[PDB]
Write a protein that binds this ligand. Structure first.
Ligand SMILES: [Zn+2]
Lengths: 346, 320
């Protein structure tokens, strides 16, 4: 509910649309740089730290037992509190390939305000999903047992339906959800009759029994489906039970960002509603035991610099603070081509 | 040209030049995508439609708002059709070459064609007389050149055609043009990757053509030598310039290069570079950062373009 302009460090070019903001004990790290790693930073992850609305991207190193990984430009990620760590999988390479490997970022050590990481990857057996981007991953619990729930984004054509002149064209994947054990790597696709087509850059909320979907864009008819989804999960002793229901009240949005403000209390910043007009108004949500209800805020004021532009992007830093950017105006021809704002929600 | 044509046609009475539609037909006979041909392997992931010309360079990208933004403009040819049109252009020369080398005008293949491969950016192309500085506007081409053509008879091979001026401006046929920065990595590889796919599909194929009234067959061999230094260090996956690793053939450090002067060899290849990058990803021995840095010899990025590097004499004597 408060716009703040940020000044910038020297290395602007490592930022790019489609980044990753990770958080550990309030300390926030940048992932997903532009280009490839350099002699300055061998990894690509940085201490994203801001004082007096001034950012500095200063490097962060790995452990010995860590695994190295390229920057991924549109992955999916989720929190794993079971210690605490992040689960990241999917994404797009700097050379525009699509991997399907599941990397685990764990904090190795932190000493004298210098922290290191313990990156490991994990593969899967059985019904593997095809590599994609714009998809969504969430962790959910039941009976004390944890399980990762996935929902697809979009991908290329398969190897038979791919030619030269259409080598880069994309299509929505098949509407299936995958159940991913992290103790062994068990993966199982599931076919759901209420679900119809693919979906990309949809917003994903999960609270301990049932994962909520919202918004996103469907490539199949070039619309934004204005219907939310409520996806009930049960994991008994036997085979796990997946359930889905359709509820009214969905808002037609794509490429927004979620943020926890208070306990069981989340908020939504504006993304896109049509591909000709930016979506300006932003929304809230509130969860109970099983209820779900949207809400709208008091339309927090932007600069006109936003209101005259065309696009944006962004993510969240975790602690009720939305960090986002905007391409500059090349008409004035004295721009650094990118400005940035931080939106404290509190 | 229309003015010149109509004025000389009026003043002489005879029509010494040609009008414009005949000029359009004479240029449509020389573009890519006119003559028919086929391939003895059916060329997987290639559309076998045989009348395509200038196609969009983005190969159907994803220019919507909700995607990663890219505002570049790229126009390209399909690779096989441009190769076909280049061969049909040099048809009369290859006819008279094989006549001059004491052979028959009737001869089936296979003609083996060795092709130079190159790429370069041309810096700024903007023209603003005022309005302050307008736009830097960097752009880059991607081109090729037929270097030599050869043919055997039984077991004895003969160079049937050699080119006199390799690096000249009149023999660099362009595949694709894009208005983009040379170092803007992801856009560059995203446009150039389908032509790489077409090249690797074409590497193990057989062309069949109908030039001299009789069919001929063709194989191909590609040498990626026409790159410059900053680009070959960028698109193969090496460090830019500030490493200890300076040799693009031998893994000699800057320390050993001052120490050992000549006693090295050539030890860099494409598949081993892929393997080294996979070692950099996997990190199988859980070592530290610097020992990985010296174990892989500067390998940092995924290699994606095969390239056989070389030099030129200006850099040699200027370093001397
Ligand atoms: Zn050497």
């Amino acid at each position: 509910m408060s716009l703040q302009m940020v000044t910038v460090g020297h290395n602007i070019a490592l930022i790019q649309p489609g980044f990753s903001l990770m958080n550990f004990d309030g300390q926030v790290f940048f992932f997903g740089q532009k280009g490839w790693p350099k002699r300055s930073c061998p990894t690509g992850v940085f201490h994203f730290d801001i004082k007096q609305n001034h950012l500095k991207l200063k490097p962060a190193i790995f452990s010995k037992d860590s695994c190295y990984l390229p920057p991924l430009r549109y992955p999916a990620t989720c929190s794993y509190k079971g210690k605490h760590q992040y689960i990241i999988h999917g994404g797009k390479t700097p050379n525009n390939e699509l991997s399907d490997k599941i990397y685990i970022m764990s904090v190795a050590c932190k000493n004298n305000k210098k922290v290191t990481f313990r990156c490991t990857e994990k593969d899967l057996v059985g019904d593997v999903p095809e590599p994609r981007y714009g998809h969504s991953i969430d962790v959910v619990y039941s009976r004390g047992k944890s399980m990762g729930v996935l929902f697809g984004g979009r991908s290329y054509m398969p190897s038979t339906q791919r030619t030269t002149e259409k080598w880069n064209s994309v299509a929505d994947c098949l509407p299936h959800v995958f159940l991913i054990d992290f103790e062994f790597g068990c993966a199982t696709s599931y076919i759901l009759p209420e679900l119809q087509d693919g979906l990309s850059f949809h917003v994903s909320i999960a609270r301990n029994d049932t994962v909520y979907i919202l918004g996103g864009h469907s490539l199949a008819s070039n619309i934004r489906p204005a219907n939310l989804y409520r996806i009930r999960v049960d994991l008994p002793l036997g085979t796990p039970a997946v359930n889905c229901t359709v509820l009214p009240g969905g808002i037609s949005v794509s490429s927004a960002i979620l943020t926890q403000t208070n306990n069981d209390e989340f908020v939504i910043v504006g993304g896109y509603q049509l591909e000709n007009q930016k979506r300006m108004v932003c929304s809230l949500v509130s969860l109970g035991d099983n209820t779900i209800e949207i809400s709208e805020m008091e339309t927090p004021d932007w600069t006109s610099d936003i209101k005259h532009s065309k696009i944006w992007f962004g993510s969240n830093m975790g602690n009720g603070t939305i960090f986002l950017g905007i391409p500059g105006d090349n008409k004035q021809a004295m721009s650094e081509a990118f400005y940035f704002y931080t939106l404290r929600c509190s | 040209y229309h003015k010149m044509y109509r004025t000389v046609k009026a003043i002489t009475g005879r029509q010494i030049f040609q009008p414009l539609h005949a000029l359009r037909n004479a240029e449509k006979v020389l573009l890519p995508g006119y003559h028919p041909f086929e391939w003895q392997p059916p060329l997987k992931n290639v559309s076998s439609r045989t009348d395509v010309g200038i196609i969009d360079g983005l190969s159907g990208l994803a220019s919507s708002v909700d995607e990663y933004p890219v505002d570049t403009i790229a126009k390209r040819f399909r690779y096989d059709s441009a190769l076909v049109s280049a061969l049909m252009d040099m048809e009369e020369d290859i006819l008279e070459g094989m006549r001059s080398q004491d052979l028959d005008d009737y001869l089936n293949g296979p003609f083996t064609v060795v092709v130079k491969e190159s790429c370069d950016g041309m810096g700024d192309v903007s023209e603003k007389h005022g309005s302050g500085p307008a736009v830097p506007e960097k752009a880059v081409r991607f081109s090729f050149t037929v270097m030599r053509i050869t043919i055997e008879h039984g077991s004895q091979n003969v160079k049937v055609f050699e080119e006199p001026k390799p690096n000249s401006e009149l023999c660099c046929k362009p595949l694709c043009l894009m208005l983009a920065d040379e170092s803007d990595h992801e856009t560059l590889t995203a446009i150039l990757s389908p032509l790489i796919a077409e090249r690797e599909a074409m590497k193990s194929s057989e062309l069949t053509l109908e030039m001299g009234g009789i069919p001929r067959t063709f194989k191909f061999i590609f040498r990626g030598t026409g790159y410059d230094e900053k680009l070959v260090r960028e698109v193969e996956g090496l460090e830019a310039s500030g490493s200890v690793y300076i040799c693009t053939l031998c893994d000699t450090t800057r320390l050993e290069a001052s120490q050992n002067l000549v006693f090295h060899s050539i030890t860099r290849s494409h598949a081993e570079n892929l393997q080294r990058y996979e070692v950099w990803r996997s990190n199988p021995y859980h070592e530290s950062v610097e020992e990985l840095r010296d174990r892989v010899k500067g390998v940092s990025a995924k290699p994606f373009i095969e390239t056989v590097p070389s030099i030129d004499a200006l850099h040699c004597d200027i370093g001397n």
